[PDB]
């Protein structure tokens, strides 16, 4: 009785809560492609190779459409491409909003514009003798640009401003004060949808649109109640464009945090039970510092979430049978993924580093990260067979490019928490394309069994449909 | 013939009316997850552990978005998290509506605002010498906030007011009187949905929205007839947000009360026959005092109803095959669940207590409440087998988190009302993860049979698909 | 066990990345027709025969509706049908926009109009003494016509202009400056859809419509935000009408480039994983120079993409089971397809040439291109058969139009990358209409097998359902 | 194994291109009726019998609603039913547009109105001394009427006019010039849909509707961009009403011509591959002269296309399994169908003649045309049977009215192009209603076989489900 075993999502218990939890694939990306005898094949995450050095750790990335080059802020220097093009202060994550005449990075509570000719100007009130309206700027939290104006929100308050059209340094001449007052919620983050200035409050999401008013003093932007979403973003950087909309992480006010996607003025969950438990496992301040972003290559639509001790990835194209989350990791143990701030420039993707002061470019023919080994895990779900035997256990591997015949550790559990002996089986062979990963004499499934495939290698691993002969 | 038995909803007779009624699972939450050989597993409700003390019993909870902390009114003293800010009179349940410059709690018929700098002001008419319009405020019943205004309804009348923008203590300067006059129904409760002030009456649910009028004396809020719902809330606190809308309990005016959800200006029932019989079992005054609320943890979307002698819970995520209701209870006998006013703050949920003067935080690795044993029930539906025999009765359990090998009492009925001998079978074993709960030699199903699984424990119980070998 | 083998899309590994990739049919067009025992038959691309000569290589084509004849710009000379109707400078690809009173070709950064009476005029500002508004025209990138006006976009800037109604040479009298300022994205290309002037930015797509204003100085065109598409075109010529809309290649700013189609203000992908990997294999500049166009004949609605080293073709009518891409090629080795700028005029299609200074007309009864042999490839997908034997391998071919009895080289692989011995089987016989292409004694499939059908001929090859007797 | 053979559409090869093409039923109309053991029965086209004579060949037909009689223009003489009213010059096809006070026929580039009282007036500009606006009428191409105005298009230009309400001879007093300027396409034809004047161009299909303007000089008709269709009619008379819309043939400007139907501002193809191959087999001028029209009788919705060497018919009601086209023909060889300009008047349909100077009325109890024999063909699709035998070959015929026991020629092919021996089997017997058309001992199918049923008769032939005992 040849029975197939899925590997796109593994199951198991949780030894603290005693609840069934999803054992997620690690450093793998399920690809819905009709492979051999199965409907999909697991593909290892692309490796990282150092493109060139950089000052400090990475703090932000933005693809400047105006200059057709990527501006990356690492450490304390606003690197454009590879050449340093300015001095930036601070050490925390900073949000940027590129413009046609100036590239800006909201840092240390002030919106700093790095003009394209070299000079640097900071947002401040119009001069008192000028005669234009004077505001109370406060501290800048998040920024965005839409129709030649920079929109930023005062820190700790629901008010947001817009710059003048003529002189971008100062805010608008007469009407530059706007409030997301539909609820008493402070603006955690701001952004730009299709043509709307969203305002991600601590408990609500509002959409603002230009009214086209001409008379001085008239409110340029008017709220669009019909598009309001009754959720929020947990932290300042827990939002990102994803599939022609913004995904985010619900703020604890509305309830237990959970991933979401805005659709037609409504929030739809895309986080499984295990993902929501993992997110809930964090404290408020730790989870607020998390940042999420979008990465796209091959056929996948990733939504990478950079939590302090986890790096969750949502693969939209592989969600045919349900949400598909893979936990990326760096190193042999449970360390956090080093890659951060992925952006696609020119030919190949480039990513920052959380620990080292380097920038890495994704390379698809290897899985090593900065010339180091990495761990790829695959768990099959628990299935109940009583007094049965299993002998043939074959997984199709795309044997090929490699540096050594890196063997995989294959182990099986019986209670779904702790595992048995680790059996070593060759998975790749350098420059051999027809090896089969086959193990015989698995044994007797007494009550339950779950197989964990663990591969330690510097070369891509492509595991396909898992065949077991449950005789 | 290994035949499975569902446990998400038990069925049986009712010895008073002789009607078939749903025997609901007690202190369990069905989770639609594909586990082993079943499509879902029953999970015990999380236990309650005392976080710290409080003065008196809990009377209200509301997550203050402005201050990013939860304000809880226990006994006669208002609490902001651990610290105490304010004294609140009365003894009954109180409705709160947080504001950006003041936290308010409508109590004893007057809307009392607790300003954030320490001072306390109460809503009253503008001074006579001021010159602004004088109203007849009357007694305050329910309150809400929307766009910087507090909306409260005069007790025993369909009129509701709004406070001034400049000075929030007094009502609006010129236009502060509004009526839900579409029907001769008094406003039982008020609330805010999106940008709409609801006006839950006794036969209708009217919706209002800002008209944006500028001239003095013009009605700021205008009725939206197209969204009217022809039902009502039975009591002042029988409403709550749920799935981007308000659920409620129908007022007896429109017919027998039943749990409803508002959708696109229409009420759709979500209460089964048994739930609505239980609701109808109460008198008008008793069922009016019931309070209902929303709790969201893990992936479930609970809708907890606090009836005087029952605590019904609607699990939205587990309603795939139909509405799923579980009756929570505290203690070994039919006492009412002590947990009340659940709110998620920071990392972990916190709940008040109906009897003691404490606050409890939900803990997921135990099921004990304030270090006390609790009872979990699971009923399988009645099924007709004639002259058949059943031997194997296995219920997969997630053993391992416990303090003692708490055994379960397994009993089977024959007429669906009263049960037979109670058999004790070990359910958990402390820190053993592969125990099976198996019973052989069940007996002969003569005409009908129904199994009641009863667990008394201080640790979580996770029961899965129940199979019986009806040979 | 006679088992059929699809050939509409071949599948296999990739020896560099070790990833499974689609082996696309080469010089084939799947036709969804119920043929004999199969649901579709593979049809060779029509051949190319030299209609007449031309000066230089082909640079553009446009079917002039006003004169009901095709205008083709080859080399440095503009051609109308057979005749030479003006001199055009430059060497790169040129975009044209035919008009009722002039045929124009935006070349070398200036919009040059070739009036129908012989004279040539170039767009320039109105004379200073005229009194009309003076603009900063800059360099012309892309052009289009709509309601008697020529719309062109300033190179390296998001501004686009419109010509005057009375005198088409100069821009509009008072209002001729328009900007796609919704984002800081430069306009990569312009076009006309329905009555809208699109503006393909480097990161966004905007739709413009006439406002019908009469007063002087009022903006004739107003942006239509509701139709915005949040994607972009890779290069100036990476767009074309396709199925009552524009398809394109995504700019690298929004992520990895991938072929898209605009629908109801939303971009829907039509590129499989292999296609977008092939597209990503190119650098930014190389992929910018790519040009794509639409060709429609028989039942196929092709979307031909002219990449520097590949010619991908999307067959809209054959996408029943998923996107269908065929890689056209010229010569025995991997050279790029010579045919370029296809247009249907009169009775038969005509196409330019990338290398020679000739124009070819598509001829359907041959597959030779300019009297040369061409290669047609067909790959069957990899399928897992263990210890099985295959004897009968038959493909139905429509025989008879050939010149000589051309033969096909049939080979089978075992690892999906490199192939075995090439077996030669007669496929057509000149003027015999009932030959069967049958091969016996294929052999034993050890682990995997994939058949490559390679035909070298000067006559059309029509291969139908492939049956293999996997005994 | 009694296996049924469809006859609604036949399959075969094409000896020139070697492509599989549809062998269409000839002079037959598939009727989707559940007959005996089959889902439909083939019915011969109704025959033509001479009602009375006429002068010259037929050039146009239009059912005059105002006079409740059909006006037919044959040769150089205009006819109203039997009687002869007007005199018409020219020799080519003429477009008519009936009016309440005048019947008009656009001929020789001038719109000529035949008033109902006998006088004849031609459209010309208003007299110079009158004072009304003077236009440049030019040559008339196509005409239509809507709300008391005649709309005609200037030949070789996209401008169209409308006549005055008071005096219909001259165009409108102040506003009679209108342009389909959305594209630089000349108006190939004009027509009226509901209350819209279409302006069928050479690359677009623009619409127009009355604006209801009252002031002199205001444009009465304003464009409706939202209904624009981005296709065109190949020739002046390649359009006709069909199923509450206009079907047409695509102009070569947009690609290869193909029969289309306009729906909700979008063109949907209804032409199979073989139909558009037949259409494309014509040159531009030849296919431009084609005229297409609608005929509706019984349950069929015919859409007859009169191409120079083919007469294609689309039967809408029989398109359940896909488009259904039958090629009508006159005579034993490939001559073109003589019937033209079908119109239903009174009790029975009447049709003109392409060659003779007569008018024929359709008669349903015969298939002879003007007392001549006609040929009906039926091809079964090619199906692959190897080493099989077929003995019983029965087709259900509705034997009945006839003049002689007209036998059918039944032949079978082996390569799908050329056929074998013609076997003669009695199909009808005069005055006998229970004959069966049965042939035994068909033979052995070496690889492929296709049966061609050919009937030469002067009486209707009704062939039903064809069964073959493939033993």
Note the main attributes of this structure.
part of a larger assembly; 4 chains; 471 residues; seven-stranded antiparallel beta sheet; five-stranded antiparallel beta sheet; 42 strands
Work out the number of β strands of chain A: 42
Main beta-sheet annotation of chain A = 7 strands, antiparallel
Euclidean distance between termini CA atoms of chain A = 5 Å
Largest interface: A-B, 49 and 48 residues
Shape of chain A: elongated
The percentage helix of chain A is: under 10%
Given the structure, what is the number of helices of chain A?
A: 2
Strand content of chain A: over 45%
The rounded Rg of chain A comes to 25 Å
SS content category of chain A? mainly beta
Oligomer: part of a larger assembly
Organism (chains A, B, C, D): Salmonella phage P22 (Bacteriophage P22)
Keywords (chains A, B, C, D): Late protein, Virion
Main location (chains A, B, C, D): virion
Pfam families (chains A, B, C, D): Phage_stabilise
